[PDB]
Amino acid sequence: TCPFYKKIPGTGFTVDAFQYGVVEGCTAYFLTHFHSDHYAGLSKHFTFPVYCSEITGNLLKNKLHVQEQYIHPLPLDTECIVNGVKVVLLDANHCPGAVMILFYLPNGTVILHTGDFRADPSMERSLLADQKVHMLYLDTTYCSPEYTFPSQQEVIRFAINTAFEAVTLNPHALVVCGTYSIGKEKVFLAIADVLGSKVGMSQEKYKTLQCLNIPEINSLITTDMCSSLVHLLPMMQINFKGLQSHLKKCGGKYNQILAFRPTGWTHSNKFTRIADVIPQTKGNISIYGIPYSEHSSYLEMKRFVQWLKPQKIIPTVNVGTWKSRSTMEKYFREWKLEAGY
Ligand code: NI
Numbered sequence: 542t543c544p545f546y547k548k549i550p551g552t553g554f555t556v557d558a559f560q561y562g563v564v565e566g567c568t569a570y571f572l573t574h575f576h577s578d579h580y581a582g583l584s585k586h587f588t589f590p591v592y593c594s595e596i597t598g599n600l601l602k603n604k605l606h607v608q609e610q611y612i613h614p615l616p617l618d619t620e621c622i623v624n625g626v627k628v629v630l631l632d633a634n635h636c637p638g639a640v641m642i643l644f645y646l647p648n649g650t651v652i653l654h655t656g657d658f659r660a661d662p663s664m665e666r667s668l669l670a671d672q673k674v675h676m677l678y679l680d681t682t683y684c685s686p687e688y689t690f691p692s693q694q695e696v697i698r699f700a701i702n703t704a705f706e707a708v709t710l711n712p713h714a715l716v717v718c719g720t721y722s723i724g725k726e727k728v729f730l731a732i733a734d735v736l737g738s739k740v741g742m743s744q745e746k747y748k749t750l751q752c753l754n755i756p757e758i759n760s761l762i763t764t765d766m767c768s769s770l771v772h773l774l775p776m777m778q779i780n781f782k783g784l785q786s787h788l789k790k791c792g793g794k795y796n797q798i799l800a801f802r803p804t805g806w807t808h809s810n811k812f813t814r815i816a817d818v819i820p821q822t823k824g825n826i827s828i829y830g831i832p833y834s835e836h837s838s839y840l841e842m843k844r845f846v847q848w849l850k851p852q853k854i855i856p857t858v859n860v861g862t863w864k865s866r867s868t869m870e871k872y873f874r875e876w877k878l879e880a881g882y
Contacts, residue, residue, distance in 0.1 A: 543567075546855050547677060549654070551646050552626055554652050556678070568831070573656025574598045574639035576722050583607060592623060596628060596638025600723075601750040613822055618668060631667050633658035635835045636724025637753045643668065653851070660837040660845035667682055669849070677851035682836045682858045684869050688806055688841065690832040691815045694842045697731050700801060700831060701814050702820045702871040704732045707771065707799045714797035716771045719779040722834050723749060725803045730761055733771045733800075741769030767794070776802065788826070797825045803833040850882040 543565075543850040553568030560583035564570075566671055572580060572593040583591070585606040593601065599615035601607040603825050611814045615621050617640065619632045627645035634703040635657045645650040653674045716736070740762050742750075745765045757760065763769060774787060779802045788798055799820075809818070810832050820827040837845065846854070854873050859865045 544860075546857050546860065549644055549652060549766055551648060551650070552644065553624060554626070554644070556642065557656070559587075569843055571642060571654075572597055572601075573642065574636055575604075575652070576636065576657070576724075579657075580605070587611060588878065592628075592642060594638045594640050596753055597640075599754075600638070600749070603752050606750065627631070627679070629668055631664070631669065634661050634664075636660060636722070637726065638723075650675045652676045652678070655680045655847070655857075657682075657835070658837060659835055660841040662844075664845065665848055674849055675852045675861055676855060677846070677849065677853070678855045678857055679842075679846070680836065680858055681842070681856040681860075681869055683806060683834075684842060684859065684872060686839050686855070687811060689706075689811050690806060690834050692728065693833060695815050696831050697727060697835045699818065700829075701731055701735045703829070704799060707797075710737060711794055713817060714799060715788070715791065715795040717779070717800040718771065718773055718786065719776040719800070719802045720746070720773050723753070725833055726750070726753075728757070728801060728803050728831075728833060729771060729773060733761060733769075736770060736843040738770045739763040739768065740771045740772040740773060741766040745775060745808050766791075770795075779828060781826055784826045784828070785824075795859075798827070800828045802828060802830045804830050805832070805834045805836060840858075846873075847876050847880040847882075850880065 543555060543558050543561040547556050549556065553566060554571060555564055556571045557573055558564055558577040559580060570589050572589050572591055575597050578610045583605050585608065588611060591611055592613045592615060594613045598612045602609060610633050615630050617632060621628050629643040630640040633639040633641045633656050641656055641658055642654045651674050653670060653791065655678060655681050704716050714773055716732060729740050740760065742764060744764050747762060750758060750762055760794050766772060779800055784800055788795060791853060809829055820829040856869050
């Protein structure tokens with residue numbers, strides 16, 4: 542049955558609640574972003590109104606074959622009305638098309654649902670600055686002080702330099718980058734760009750990125766693997782057997798793979814700086830795990846909340862265990878008491 546944290550009180554609204562059939566008393570279904578845990582249950586046969594971003598809308602039409610008359614895409618940073626309730630979509634700095642949702646209830650309460658997000662100081666100059674928030678439905682994915690990671694910028698700087706070095710030293714080396722859902726595109730595109738190559742991929746994944754409105758995307762991506770020296774594969778294939786397999790398929794066009802697994806966090810971040818990362822190697826294959834997160838770090842999260850000073854916080858992630866819930870409520874109390882709200 543739909544959990545309480547996916548229901549917006551005093552509205553007929555749900556957020557990311559498509560896996561519970563017809564939810565009792567839901568007149569409108571919100572979808573923050575196109576990841577499987579959140580869209581789980583959508584299909585062509587869905588006949589309720591879905592509200593989402595333009596990009597998330599394109600992917601619902603094309604990838605899931607949802608009928609067009611049920612997709613209500615909304616522009617960002619714009620006051621819209623839905624079943625007589627004022628709403629706004631803000632950029633979540635997650636994956637493409639991903640949004641946070643502000644709800645202005647008729648009684649005067651104001652609710653921010655972050656969806657999935659990576660908190661940034663640039664959010665403190667959106668429509669969020671203008672007014673108070675009573676409730677915050679917070680993506681608490683890395684809600685613990687051990688979760689630290691570098692900026693997306695430094696991680697990219699690392700990947701670029703690394704990849705440029707390897708391929709200048711060996712022109713017959715192939716770069717491979719792992720993917721399983723939309724998001725993390727800057728990794729593979731920045732590497733392609735610095736190498737003067739396009740990114741080769743499967744047709745299904747080429748179709749997916751074509752939905753997103755990237756600038757000059759046709760310039761960046763392709764389905765001709767032969768003409769490319771940056772390949773994308775499923776994340777599952779990023780291991781020594783998978784990569785040896787794929788190397789075989791390229792027919793003596795390459796003799797070496799360098800490969801990246803963009804993960805969220807790894808316990809190597811507790812001990813090791815980004816400059817100090819090294820790969821796993823077996824034969825002519827090297828695999829780098831890099832900490833490119835699309836979620837808030839502990840510190841970014843804490844700052845975001847202390848800036849916003851919400852009256853109540855409802856966690857949306859890691860809620861399934863009593864020790865987790867409890868550890869989060871402790872940090873929430875620290876953040877409140879430190880900041881004096
Ligand atoms: Ni997500």
